[PDB]
Amino acid sequence: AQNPNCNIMIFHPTKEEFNDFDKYIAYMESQGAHRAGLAKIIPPKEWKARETYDNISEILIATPLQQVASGRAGVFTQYHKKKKAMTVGEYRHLANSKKYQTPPHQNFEDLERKYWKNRIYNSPIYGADISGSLFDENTKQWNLGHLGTIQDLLEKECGVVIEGVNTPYLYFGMWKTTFAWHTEDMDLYSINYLHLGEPKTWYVVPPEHGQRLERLARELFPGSSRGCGAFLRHKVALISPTVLKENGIPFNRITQEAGEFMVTFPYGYHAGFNHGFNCAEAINFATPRWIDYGKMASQCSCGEARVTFSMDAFVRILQPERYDLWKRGQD
Ligand SMILES: O=C(O)CNC(=O)C(=O)O
Numbered sequence: 001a002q003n004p005n006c007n008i009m010i011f012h013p014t015k016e017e018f019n020d021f022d023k024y025i026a027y028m029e030s031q032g033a034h035r036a037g038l039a040k041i042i043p044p045k046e047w048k049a050r051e052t053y054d055n056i057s058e059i060l061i062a063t064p065l066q067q068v069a070s071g072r073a074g075v076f077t078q079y080h081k082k083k084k085a086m087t088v089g090e091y092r093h094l095a096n097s098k099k100y101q102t103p104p105h106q107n108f109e110d111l112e113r114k115y116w117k118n119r120i121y122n123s124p125i126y127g128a129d130i131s132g133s134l135f136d137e138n139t140k141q142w143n144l145g146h147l148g149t150i151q152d153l154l155e156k157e158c159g160v161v162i163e164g165v166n167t168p169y170l171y172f173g174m175w176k177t178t179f180a181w182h183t184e185d186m187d188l189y190s191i192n193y194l195h196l197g198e199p200k201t202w203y204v205v206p207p208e209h210g211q212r213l214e215r216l217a218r219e220l221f222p223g224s225s226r227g228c229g230a231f232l233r234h235k236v237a238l239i240s241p242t243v244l245k246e247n248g249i250p251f252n253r254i255t256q257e258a259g260e261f262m263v264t265f266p267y268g269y270h271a272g273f274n275h276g277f278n279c280a281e282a283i284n285f286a287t288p289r290w291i292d293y294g295k296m297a298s299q300c301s302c303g304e305a306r307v308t309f310s311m312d313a314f315v316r317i318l319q320p321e322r323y324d325l326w327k328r329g330q331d
Pocket residue numbers: 171178179190191192200264270280282283
């Protein structure tokens with residue numbers, strides 16, 4: 001078995017290897033990358049996502065989200081308070097302000113210590129989940145707006161034609177902006193490209209150990225757990241590396257820098273934080289190997305998780321027994 005300790009793997013494809021996205025994913029999996037839940041892909045030196053980022057300031061962040069925490073430093077939830085719209089240029093200035101900017105630090109490890117010590121005492125503002133793309137239309141390799149769609153993959157594998165679409169999302173971050181512990185919708189893959197700015201630190205639980213994280217989460221968030229049998233689908237709970245280590249939960253960590261891709265694999269729980277002003281682009285995707293994970297994915301039916309139009313068909317076809325209850329949650 002390849003990668004039996006489930007370490008995060010880092011890949012350096014050549015420009016020739018960067019042509020065929022599906023083939024490269026399957027290569028990485030042949031080497032055991034999926035066992036970690038997360039892999040890093042450094043693009044060939046010849047590649048670029050676009051020519052410059054000099055003209056992005058007029059993108060609108062219609063609903064910036066202030067991430068307010070509750071709990072203790074290593075075990076907390078966050079809720080998202082909606083703020084007034086602002087442009088990317090306005091948000092960048094805000095991220096660089098004395099109130100929100102990255103503190104002085106020695107290295108990524110020192111910054112990580114500071115994040116876990118102090119996150120809860122601040123409420124950073126995240127421009128998340130903005131439909132759109134920063135890839136140039138002429139970028140032909142690993143262009144996250146030109147991937148094969150999940151609907152087409154389901155149709156190729158299973159023969160059933162379904163409605164729905166699959167487009168990317170932009171994320172504008174600042175120091176301490178936080179992504180809570182989650183797997184993707186329908187335990188899909190994700191791919192995330194850090195277009196510019198400061199790093200993003202990731203934490204990940206190997207898919208084979210995801211239920212260990214879930215059991216810890218039910219213990220640490222006991223009211224949430226009574227409310228919903230899949231409350232990590234709400235994407236609000238944080239647990240620090242120190243708490244994970246104290247409870248014996250297998251995990252790994254890695255920092256993504258500008259110009260790098262990360263891939264999350266089916267049922268790979270992940271969480272993390274931004275080091276300073278940045279912009280990322282991410283999208284979900286599928287492969288043949290996903291289908292079985294899609295069929296087994298948990299679902300929130302309490303009403304909190306509320307998701308895209310396109311998840312309907314995935315539930316309806318892959319999980320027809322759950323469909324009725326899940327759809328009640330959506331309506
Ligand atoms: O970058 C973020 O805030 C969150 N991204 C992801 O969870 C991802 O790409 O799957």
